Amino acid sequence: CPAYSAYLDC
Amino acid sequence: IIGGEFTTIENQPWFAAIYRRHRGGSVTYVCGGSLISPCWVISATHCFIDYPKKEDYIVYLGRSRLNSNTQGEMKFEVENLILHKDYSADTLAYHNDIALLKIRSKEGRCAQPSRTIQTIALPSMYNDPQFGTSCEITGFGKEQSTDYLYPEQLKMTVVKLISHRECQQPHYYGSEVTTKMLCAADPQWKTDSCQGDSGGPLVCSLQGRMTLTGIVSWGRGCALKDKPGVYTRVSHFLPWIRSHTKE
Ligand SMILES: N=C(N)N1CCCCC1
């Protein structure tokens, strides 16, 4: 996961 | 969506809700997407990369609520999951963050348009609105960064496009923003996309048409000063889209 992910599983 | 307002699927009838099935049977929300033709939904690759098996996904159209059915809704299996070959993820952000889902019902049918289920127009190549233009975002993402839960009711808000020049300054994201991305934010930074809005539509009316200008991709925090939302710039991906949609 990149620090600026918005993905509901990060 | 931070701030904005609750809405219903009639106000964004191309909105696709994407869910992932589990083994012991539980189904959970994954990402947003946008219906661009009866058999095709566009979303973001990062939604799927970790579990890229199509059999694992369900798509709903005409759905206004996250974990309750909406009258008139349609459920679909994912016949084909197409992830962009040049996708990458940094310490910070995603690149080429775009995906296509070919949907078919257990009956073998694509989406049947209705008052709650419509397609959205793609843009013209390399043609995006002016910076400062107001556009709409929609999704079931968090209402606050600190929330553990996601809203059960769909939401939407407005953000304004930011110049590439402005978004590339280190005060903002510096070099992390490429030309295949678009930034957009609230001038007070009070409203934004957030966790679980990924893959969903950024919609602008360029000329007279409501048009899919961006796909929710990344950002630092949500509704955070000097940290805009970043969107896959759909007008830079038209050859990729038409190529993989001619079947
Ligand atoms: N727009 C913002 N702030 N985002 C986009 C979605 C991932 C979370 C951060």
Author numbering:
A (entry chain P): 1 to 10
B (entry chain U): 16 to 37, 37A, 37B, 37C, 37D, 38 to 60, 60A, 60B, ...
Article passage:
One interesting member of the trypsin family of serine proteases is urokinase-type plasminogen activator (uPA), which catalyses the conversion of the zymogen plasminogen into the active protease plasmin through cleavage of plasminogen's Arg15–Val16 bond (using the chymotrypsin numbering). From a phage-displayed peptide library, we previously isolated a serum-stable, disulfide bond-constrained peptide, CPAYSRYLDC, termed mupain-1, which competitively inhibits murine uPA (muPA). In the complexes, the inhibitory peptides adopt cyclic conformations with an overall Ω shape.
Two variants of mupain-1, with the unnatural amino acids L-4-guanidino-phenylalanine or L-3-(N-amidino-4-piperidyl)alanine as P1 residues instead of the original Arg, have a 2- to 10-fold improved affinities. Mupain-1-12 and mupain-1-16 have around 10-fold higher affinities to huPA-H99Y than mupain-1. In each of the structures, the amino acid in position 6 of the peptide, i.e., Arg, 4-guanidinophenylalanine, or L-3-(N-amidino-4-piperidyl)alanine, forms polar interactions to Asp189, Ser190, and Gly218 in the S1 pocket. Considering the unexpected effect of the D9A substitution, we also crystallised mupain-1-16 D9A in complex with huPA-H99Y, but in spite of the much higher affinity of the D9A peptides, the structures of the mupain-1-16 and the mupain-1-16-D9A complex were indistinguishable. Noticeably, however, the relative B-factor for mupain-1-16 D9A was higher than that for mupain-1-16 (1.39 versus 1.24). In both cases, the bound forms of the peptides had the Cys1-Pro2 peptide bond in the trans conformation, showing that the binding involves a shift in the equilibrium between the conformations towards the trans-form.
